[PDB]
Short mmCIF file of C-alpha atoms and ligand atoms in Angstrom, two decimals:
data_model
loop_
_atom_site.label_atom_id
_atom_site.label_comp_id
_atom_site.label_asym_id
_atom_site.label_seq_id
_atom_site.Cartn_x
_atom_site.Cartn_y
_atom_site.Cartn_z
CA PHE A 214 90.14 75.18 126.62
CA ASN A 215 87.45 74.72 123.89
CA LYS A 216 85.57 77.99 124.45
CA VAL A 217 88.60 80.28 124.25
CA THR A 218 90.15 80.01 120.80
CA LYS A 219 104.95 82.11 109.22
CA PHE A 220 104.88 85.86 108.75
CA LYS A 221 107.06 88.71 107.58
CA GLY A 222 109.61 88.40 110.36
CA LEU A 223 107.10 88.18 113.23
CA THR A 224 107.64 85.03 115.30
CA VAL A 225 105.59 84.04 118.38
CA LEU A 226 108.09 82.48 120.88
CA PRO A 227 106.81 79.45 122.93
CA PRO A 228 105.62 79.70 126.57
CA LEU A 229 108.29 78.22 128.92
CA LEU A 230 105.81 76.52 131.26
CA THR A 231 103.91 74.01 129.09
CA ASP A 232 100.15 73.90 129.71
CA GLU A 233 100.63 70.36 131.12
CA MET A 234 102.76 71.81 134.02
CA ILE A 235 100.43 74.79 134.59
CA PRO B 299 61.23 103.60 79.39
CA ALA B 300 59.68 101.01 81.75
CA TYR B 301 61.87 100.73 84.89
CA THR B 302 62.83 97.47 86.69
CA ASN B 303 64.79 97.33 90.01
CA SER B 304 68.08 95.36 89.88
CA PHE B 305 68.38 93.32 93.09
CA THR B 306 71.88 91.99 94.00
CA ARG B 307 72.94 91.69 90.31
CA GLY B 308 75.86 93.13 88.29
CA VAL B 309 78.62 91.71 90.54
CA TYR B 310 81.67 90.58 88.45
CA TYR B 311 84.90 88.88 89.59
CA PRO B 312 87.18 91.92 90.09
CA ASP B 313 90.52 90.17 89.27
CA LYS B 314 92.14 86.74 88.64
CA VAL B 315 93.59 86.46 92.18
CA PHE B 316 91.96 83.45 93.92
CA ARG B 317 90.85 84.07 97.51
CA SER B 318 89.54 81.23 99.71
CA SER B 319 87.06 81.88 102.60
CA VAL B 320 88.25 85.55 102.61
CA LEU B 321 85.97 88.65 102.64
CA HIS B 322 87.74 91.24 100.42
CA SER B 323 86.51 94.86 100.14
CA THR B 324 87.05 96.20 96.59
CA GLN B 325 86.50 99.78 95.39
CA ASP B 326 85.59 99.34 91.68
CA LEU B 327 82.81 100.42 89.27
CA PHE B 328 79.69 98.26 89.89
CA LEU B 329 75.89 98.60 89.48
CA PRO B 330 74.59 99.86 92.86
CA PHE B 331 72.29 97.27 94.52
CA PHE B 332 68.51 97.91 94.37
CA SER B 333 68.83 100.38 91.42
CA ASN B 334 66.07 100.93 88.77
CA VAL B 335 67.13 100.02 85.17
CA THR B 336 65.64 101.02 81.75
CA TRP B 337 63.79 97.99 80.27
CA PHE B 338 63.01 97.72 76.53
CA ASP B 339 81.24 103.96 81.75
CA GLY B 340 79.78 100.43 81.84
CA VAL B 341 76.42 98.69 81.35
CA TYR B 342 74.96 95.54 82.97
CA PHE B 343 73.21 94.64 79.68
CA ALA B 344 71.02 91.54 80.10
CA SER B 345 68.68 89.65 77.72
CA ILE B 346 65.85 87.24 78.71
CA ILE B 347 67.06 85.93 69.27
CA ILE B 348 69.42 88.70 70.58
CA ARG B 349 72.48 88.88 68.27
CA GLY B 350 75.16 91.59 68.55
CA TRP B 351 76.23 94.95 70.04
CA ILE B 352 77.40 98.03 68.08
CA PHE B 353 79.51 100.27 70.37
CA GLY B 354 81.49 103.36 69.30
CA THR B 355 82.61 106.89 70.31
CA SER B 356 83.85 101.71 66.65
CA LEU B 357 83.45 97.99 67.53
CA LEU B 358 80.75 95.52 66.41
CA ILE B 359 80.37 92.43 68.68
CA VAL B 360 78.38 90.38 66.11
CA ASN B 361 77.57 86.81 67.31
CA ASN B 362 81.43 81.46 65.07
CA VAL B 363 81.04 84.65 67.18
CA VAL B 364 82.01 87.32 64.59
CA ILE B 365 83.66 89.78 67.00
CA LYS B 366 85.07 92.76 65.03
CA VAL B 367 86.48 96.17 66.10
CA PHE B 368 92.17 97.19 64.21
CA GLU B 369 89.73 94.25 64.53
CA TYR B 370 89.86 91.01 66.58
CA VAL B 371 88.09 87.72 65.69
CA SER B 372 87.54 85.19 68.54
CA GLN B 373 85.72 81.81 68.84
CA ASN B 374 66.76 81.65 80.87
CA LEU B 375 68.92 84.82 81.30
CA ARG B 376 72.20 86.18 79.81
CA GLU B 377 74.31 88.85 81.62
CA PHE B 378 77.05 90.87 79.84
CA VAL B 379 78.83 93.55 81.93
CA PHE B 380 80.90 95.70 79.51
CA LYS B 381 83.64 98.08 80.76
CA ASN B 382 86.41 100.21 79.16
CA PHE B 383 87.87 97.00 77.20
CA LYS B 384 86.71 94.15 79.49
CA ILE B 385 83.66 91.97 78.80
CA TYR B 386 82.34 89.69 81.58
CA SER B 387 79.45 87.24 81.17
CA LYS B 388 77.24 84.51 82.63
CA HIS B 389 74.43 82.39 81.09
CA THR B 390 71.81 81.13 83.57
CA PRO B 391 68.70 79.01 82.84
CA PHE B 392 73.32 86.55 93.27
CA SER B 393 75.35 85.39 90.22
CA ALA B 394 78.93 86.61 89.57
CA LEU B 395 80.43 87.37 86.15
CA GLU B 396 83.71 85.64 85.06
CA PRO B 397 86.10 87.69 82.92
CA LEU B 398 84.75 86.04 79.71
CA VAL B 399 87.26 88.02 77.60
CA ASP B 400 89.41 91.22 77.62
CA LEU B 401 90.02 93.04 74.29
CA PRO B 402 93.10 95.24 73.62
CA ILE B 403 83.08 104.00 73.49
CA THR B 404 80.15 106.45 73.88
CA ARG B 405 76.91 104.70 72.84
CA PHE B 406 75.41 101.16 72.98
CA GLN B 407 73.16 99.53 70.30
CA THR B 408 71.73 96.00 69.90
CA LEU B 409 70.46 93.81 66.99
CA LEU B 410 68.13 90.74 67.10
CA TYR B 411 66.40 93.08 77.08
CA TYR B 412 67.14 95.11 80.28
CA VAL B 413 70.02 97.61 80.62
CA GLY B 414 71.50 99.27 83.80
CA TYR B 415 74.57 101.57 84.10
CA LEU B 416 77.36 101.09 86.76
CA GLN B 417 78.92 103.70 89.13
CA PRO B 418 82.05 103.77 91.42
CA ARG B 419 81.19 101.94 94.72
CA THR B 420 82.76 99.76 97.51
CA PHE B 421 81.47 96.19 98.09
CA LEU B 422 82.41 93.28 100.47
CA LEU B 423 82.55 90.04 98.43
CA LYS B 424 82.55 86.69 100.32
CA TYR B 425 84.72 84.11 98.48
CA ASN B 426 83.88 80.46 99.51
CA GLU B 427 86.46 77.65 99.81
CA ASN B 428 86.36 77.00 96.02
CA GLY B 429 86.97 80.74 95.37
CA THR B 430 83.42 81.60 94.15
CA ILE B 431 81.97 85.06 95.06
CA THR B 432 78.83 83.71 96.84
CA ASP B 433 77.53 87.08 98.21
CA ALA B 434 78.36 90.81 98.43
CA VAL B 435 77.19 93.94 100.35
CA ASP B 436 77.01 97.44 98.84
CA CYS B 437 78.49 99.51 101.67
CA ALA B 438 76.69 102.75 100.77
CA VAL C 111 112.08 72.77 90.68
CA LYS C 112 110.17 71.55 93.73
CA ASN C 113 110.91 71.39 97.51
CA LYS C 114 114.04 73.67 97.25
CA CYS C 115 114.14 77.40 98.18
CA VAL C 116 114.42 78.84 94.64
CA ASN C 117 113.71 82.15 92.92
CA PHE C 118 110.19 81.70 91.44
CA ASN C 119 109.10 83.79 88.41
CA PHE C 120 105.87 82.07 87.36
CA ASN C 121 104.86 84.60 84.66
CA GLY C 122 103.73 87.84 86.35
CA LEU C 123 104.69 86.88 89.94
CA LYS C 124 108.27 87.20 91.30
CA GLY C 125 109.08 85.58 94.68
CA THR C 126 111.60 83.49 96.67
CA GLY C 127 110.14 80.27 98.01
CA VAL C 128 109.86 76.47 98.24
CA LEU C 129 107.43 75.41 95.43
CA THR C 130 105.34 72.33 96.43
CA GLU C 131 102.34 70.67 94.67
CA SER C 132 99.04 71.80 96.29
CA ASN C 133 95.50 70.37 96.69
CA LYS C 134 93.35 73.57 96.54
CA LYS C 135 91.49 74.11 93.19
CA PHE C 136 91.56 77.42 91.27
CA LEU C 137 88.61 78.27 88.97
CA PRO C 138 89.71 78.33 85.28
CA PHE C 139 90.21 82.12 84.97
CA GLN C 140 92.10 82.37 88.32
CA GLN C 141 95.91 82.56 88.00
CA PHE C 142 97.57 83.28 91.39
CA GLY C 143 95.72 82.55 94.66
CA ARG C 144 96.20 84.83 97.69
CA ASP C 145 95.55 84.42 101.46
CA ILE C 146 94.43 86.64 104.39
CA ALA C 147 97.06 89.41 105.00
CA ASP C 148 97.34 89.43 101.19
CA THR C 149 100.34 87.13 100.50
CA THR C 150 100.88 84.90 97.38
CA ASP C 151 100.10 81.51 99.03
CA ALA C 152 99.65 79.58 95.74
CA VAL C 153 100.43 79.87 91.98
CA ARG C 154 99.03 77.82 89.03
CA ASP C 155 101.75 76.16 86.91
CA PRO C 156 101.38 78.03 83.59
CA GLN C 157 102.34 75.07 81.32
CA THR C 158 100.88 72.18 83.39
CA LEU C 159 97.96 74.09 84.99
CA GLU C 160 98.46 72.49 88.48
CA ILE C 161 98.11 74.44 91.74
CA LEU C 162 101.72 74.81 93.08
CA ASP C 163 101.81 76.14 96.70
CA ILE C 164 104.54 78.70 97.67
CA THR C 165 106.09 78.64 101.21
CA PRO C 166 108.81 81.08 102.47
CA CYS C 167 112.17 79.40 103.17
CA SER C 168 113.41 78.74 106.75
CA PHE C 169 113.96 81.75 109.06
CA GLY C 170 114.49 81.95 112.86
CA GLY C 171 116.85 83.28 115.53
CA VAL C 172 119.95 81.50 116.91
CA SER C 173 120.46 81.90 120.68
CA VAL C 174 123.62 80.87 122.59
CA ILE C 175 123.19 78.91 125.91
CA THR C 176 126.48 79.63 127.77
CA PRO C 177 127.46 78.16 131.19
CA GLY C 178 129.25 81.47 131.98
CA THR C 179 132.63 82.62 130.65
CA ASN C 180 134.28 81.70 134.00
CA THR C 181 132.57 78.27 134.38
CA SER C 182 133.29 77.17 130.76
CA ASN C 183 133.79 78.30 127.15
CA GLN C 184 131.72 75.41 125.72
CA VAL C 185 128.38 76.66 124.22
CA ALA C 186 125.07 75.29 122.87
CA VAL C 187 122.86 76.91 120.21
CA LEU C 188 119.00 76.86 119.97
CA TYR C 189 117.86 77.63 116.40
CA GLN C 190 114.33 78.78 117.30
CA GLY C 191 111.35 77.50 115.27
CA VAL C 192 113.35 75.53 112.62
CA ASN C 193 113.24 71.80 111.73
CA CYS C 194 116.43 69.85 112.50
CA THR C 195 116.51 68.74 108.83
CA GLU C 196 117.20 72.29 107.49
CA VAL C 197 119.68 73.51 110.18
CA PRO C 198 123.07 73.14 108.29
CA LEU D 58 134.85 83.20 114.70
CA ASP D 59 132.68 81.28 117.19
CA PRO D 60 129.19 81.20 118.78
CA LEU D 61 130.46 82.43 122.20
CA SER D 62 132.36 85.24 120.58
CA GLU D 63 129.19 86.55 118.95
CA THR D 64 127.32 86.65 122.33
CA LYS D 65 130.23 88.62 123.94
CA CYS D 66 130.19 91.10 121.01
CA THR D 67 126.38 91.59 121.39
CA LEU D 68 126.70 92.23 125.16
CA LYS D 69 129.87 94.38 124.50
CA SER D 70 131.82 92.54 127.23
CA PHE D 71 134.70 90.05 127.38
CA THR D 72 132.75 88.26 130.13
CA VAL D 73 129.36 86.67 129.39
CA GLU D 74 127.17 85.41 132.28
CA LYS D 75 125.08 82.16 132.42
CA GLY D 76 121.88 82.32 130.33
CA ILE D 77 120.40 82.27 126.80
CA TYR D 78 121.36 85.33 124.72
CA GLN D 79 119.76 86.18 121.36
CA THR D 80 122.63 86.88 118.97
CA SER D 81 121.61 86.22 115.34
CA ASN D 82 119.00 85.25 112.72
CA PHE D 83 119.41 82.22 110.36
CA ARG D 84 117.97 82.25 106.82
CA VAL D 85 118.14 79.54 104.11
CA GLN D 86 119.48 81.46 101.06
CA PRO D 87 117.92 80.38 97.69
CA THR D 88 119.57 77.30 96.09
CA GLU D 89 118.79 77.95 92.34
CA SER D 90 116.62 79.94 89.84
CA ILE D 91 113.40 78.96 87.91
CA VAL D 92 111.27 80.84 85.31
CA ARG D 93 107.93 79.43 84.10
CA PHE D 94 106.09 81.10 81.16
CA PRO D 95 102.80 79.79 79.56
CA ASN D 96 102.85 77.09 76.81
CA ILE D 97 103.52 79.43 73.84
CA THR D 98 101.26 77.44 71.43
CA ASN D 99 100.20 80.64 69.56
CA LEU D 100 102.24 81.59 66.41
CA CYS D 101 101.35 83.95 63.53
CA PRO D 102 101.74 83.97 59.72
CA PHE D 103 105.27 85.15 58.90
CA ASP D 104 105.40 81.67 57.24
CA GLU D 105 102.60 82.66 54.87
CA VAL D 106 104.83 85.65 53.85
C1 LIG E 655 109.82 76.84 55.36
O1 LIG E 655 109.46 75.45 55.37
C2 LIG E 655 110.50 74.54 55.77
C3 LIG E 655 109.89 73.16 55.75
O2 LIG E 655 108.86 73.04 54.78
C4 LIG E 655 111.06 74.93 57.14
O3 LIG E 655 112.18 74.13 57.47
C5 LIG E 655 111.46 76.40 57.15
O4 LIG E 655 111.86 76.76 58.46
C6 LIG E 655 110.28 77.25 56.73
N1 LIG E 655 110.61 78.66 56.78
C7 LIG E 655 109.70 79.58 57.09
C8 LIG E 655 110.18 80.99 57.11
O5 LIG E 655 108.54 79.29 57.32
#
């Protein structure tokens, strides 16, 4: 989780399965 | 006509816009890095006593500082990039030149020093958090 | 005005935004700051010379959660990516 | 007229099935207007004429 790392109409929608269920 | 190389000098803040921790590539007239300069559209005039500049196709920048051109009156190493009319400057006991003043020309004279002449080029200028151009790379 | 979506015309820069006081420091010559992707993130108050940040006002997409026209006609609405304070 | 009506109009049906359907975009329109110009301290000598 450490190693791997608002705009003009471009919204990033949230992931349905939270990373605490994955 | 003694010649001295100019190493990483003649960089001037291109515009007022503040950029923080952003590398911006600007195509603008600049003195190419590592270019020989004579040592006695723009000039990176520098002086190690020196008083004023007479520039005309006329304007006399006599140094209050008796600037005169229509005429306008205003208020170790010294660097004075001049462009057509924008004057940048820095006084230092890589250094970038603030826009010291902009005033609403074919030949350069001086009265009482190294001169170099700029060309169109593209450079990558690294602004730090406090918006200071710490470094640059000539891309050619 | 501050903290209200307003039309901002600090001299030379025209934009619609929420103007808030900001902590970043512009060098004396600098007027308007800019951020990656080249947007006008901050402006310097001309009269008071303070760094006033600019943020775009709320935008998002409403979505309707329906039980099914047959099961019911009652609906719910998710306003995506907005803060409950600014919804109405 | 209503949130359900907008979903039915988007799907072009009088029946809408169970789910979440994107129908619209919400924007806060600007409340007022502001203009800020620099402290105009400078003035010139018409007074001397
Ligand atoms: C002349 O001076 C008076 C005060 O001494 C002032 O009220 C008036 O506006 C002035 N007019 C001009 C043209 O300077």
